[PDB]
Design an enzyme around this catalytic site. Sequence first.
Site, PDB file in Angstrom:
ATOM      1  N   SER A  12       0.705  -1.109   0.092  1.00  0.00           N
ATOM      2  CA  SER A  12      -0.089  -0.210   0.035  1.00  0.00           C
ATOM      3  C   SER A  12       0.898   1.436  -0.181  1.00  0.00           C
ATOM      4  CB  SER A  12      -1.181  -0.060   1.060  1.00  0.00           C
ATOM      5  OG  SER A  12      -0.278   0.348   2.460  1.00  0.00           O
ATOM      6  N   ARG A  64      23.799 -11.489   5.743  1.00  0.00           N
ATOM      7  CA  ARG A  64      23.392 -10.138   5.038  1.00  0.00           C
ATOM      8  C   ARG A  64      24.021  -9.317   4.248  1.00  0.00           C
ATOM      9  NH1 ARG A  64      18.982  -8.548   8.569  1.00  0.00           N
ATOM     10  NH2 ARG A  64      19.523 -10.204   9.997  1.00  0.00           N
ATOM     11  N   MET A  89      11.053  -5.518   5.326  1.00  0.00           N
ATOM     12  CA  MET A  89      11.275  -5.845   6.596  1.00  0.00           C
ATOM     13  C   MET A  89      12.411  -6.497   7.178  1.00  0.00           C
ATOM     14  SD  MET A  89       8.528  -4.889   8.142  1.00  0.00           S
ATOM     15  CE  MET A  89       8.643  -5.643   9.825  1.00  0.00           C
ATOM     16  N   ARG A  90      13.613  -6.265   6.231  1.00  0.00           N
ATOM     17  CA  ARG A  90      14.899  -6.610   6.467  1.00  0.00           C
ATOM     18  C   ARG A  90      16.167  -5.521   7.117  1.00  0.00           C
ATOM     19  NH1 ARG A  90      14.844 -11.924   7.465  1.00  0.00           N
ATOM     20  NH2 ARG A  90      17.102 -11.782   7.076  1.00  0.00           N
ATOM     21  N   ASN A 106      12.866   5.200   5.239  1.00  0.00           N
ATOM     22  CA  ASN A 106      12.184   4.370   5.400  1.00  0.00           C
ATOM     23  C   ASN A 106      10.829   4.673   6.234  1.00  0.00           C
ATOM     24  OD1 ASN A 106      11.712   1.317   6.373  1.00  0.00           O
ATOM     25  ND2 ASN A 106      11.873   2.106   8.602  1.00  0.00           N
ATOM     26  N   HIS A 108       7.962   4.145   9.158  1.00  0.00           N
ATOM     27  CA  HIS A 108       7.813   3.186  10.314  1.00  0.00           C
ATOM     28  C   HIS A 108       6.621   3.551  11.214  1.00  0.00           C
ATOM     29  CE1 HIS A 108       9.177   1.116  13.739  1.00  0.00           C
ATOM     30  NE2 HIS A 108       8.691   2.055  14.493  1.00  0.00           N
ATOM     31  N   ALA A 140      19.678   4.797   9.203  1.00  0.00           N
ATOM     32  CA  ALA A 140      21.097   4.783   9.670  1.00  0.00           C
ATOM     33  C   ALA A 140      21.464   3.477   9.965  1.00  0.00           C
ATOM     34  CB  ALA A 140      21.075   5.866  10.866  1.00  0.00           C
ATOM     35  N   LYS A 170      -1.991   3.670   8.598  1.00  0.00           N
ATOM     36  CA  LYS A 170      -1.512   3.623   6.967  1.00  0.00           C
ATOM     37  C   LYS A 170      -2.166   4.759   6.105  1.00  0.00           C
ATOM     38  CE  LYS A 170      -0.501  -1.221   6.177  1.00  0.00           C
ATOM     39  NZ  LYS A 170      -0.630  -2.404   5.216  1.00  0.00           N
ATOM     40  N   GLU A 173       0.739   7.253   6.722  1.00  0.00           N
ATOM     41  CA  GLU A 173       1.610   6.697   5.983  1.00  0.00           C
ATOM     42  C   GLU A 173       1.767   7.144   4.600  1.00  0.00           C
ATOM     43  OE1 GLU A 173       3.019   2.750   6.786  1.00  0.00           O
ATOM     44  OE2 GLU A 173       1.719   2.495   8.551  1.00  0.00           O
TER      45      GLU A 173
END
EC number: 6.3.4.13
Length: 200
Positions: A12, A64, A89-90, A106, A108, A140, A170, A173
């Site tokens: 979304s 990673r 989500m990583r 990002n 959040h 960061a 959302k 967001e």
Amino acid sequence: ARVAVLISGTGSNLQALIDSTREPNSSAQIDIVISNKAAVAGLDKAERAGIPTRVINHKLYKNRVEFDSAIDLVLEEFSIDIVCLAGFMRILSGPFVQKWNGKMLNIHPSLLPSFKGSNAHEQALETGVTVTGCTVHFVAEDVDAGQIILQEAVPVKRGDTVATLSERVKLAEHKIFPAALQLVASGTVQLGENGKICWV
Ligand SMILES: Nc1nc2[nH]c(CCCCc3csc(C(=O)N[C@@H](CCC(=O)O)C(=O)O)c3)cc2c(=O)[nH]1
Ligand SMILES: NCC(=O)N[C@@H]1O[C@H](COP(=O)([O-])[O-])[C@@H](O)[C@H]1O
């Protein structure tokens, strides 16, 4: 500015960015969508919008750093200027974050610095706040600790669940992530050399 959007799920936030970046005055264009997960709805939204997609499965890499290197290769392939993490989500490795310092955003679903982590709504509800919200920040190395660009408060209603609260948050967001991307892509906001946010 050329933008990559990284996703892990529904998409979304990706859709709101697609809509905003297609408005005539947009300083950003989305040139690639990368998912770490196959067959997620966000990929459908990208394809329907005529945007290239790549699936980079994190499960297929030794660590990673190797996974991030695979992402980075695609970013270079598409000459990307700005990275948006939109339901991705990583946790990203230090060198990747450092390379993209001041260029990676990002979203959040809390008012940082409250409720860092992957289950912000669960935390907000357990804690009992009556006001939560969302945050767009520069990424960061320390997770959810980068410089804040925009935030929007959202009320918690009595009887809320993760389902109803996440739905309400959302909506916010989808407002602030497009706005923040435009601020950074237009060069209006940058990460300052001193590390603090700079409004030019
Ligand atoms: N260096 C760094 N990486 C970042 N990635 C994201 C993006 C947002 C991360 C949210 C998030 C918070 S904790 C967590 C997590 O534990 N992820 C696990 C796997 C979770 C899963 O796959 O379901 C992991 O990476 O091992 C995910 C934001 C951000 C950041 O600010 N800094
Ligand atoms: N960054 C940690 C986190 O919890 N992210 C959250 O995941 C959801 C993705 O929804 P979407 O796939 O519909 O954009 C969004 O609510 C986003 O803020």
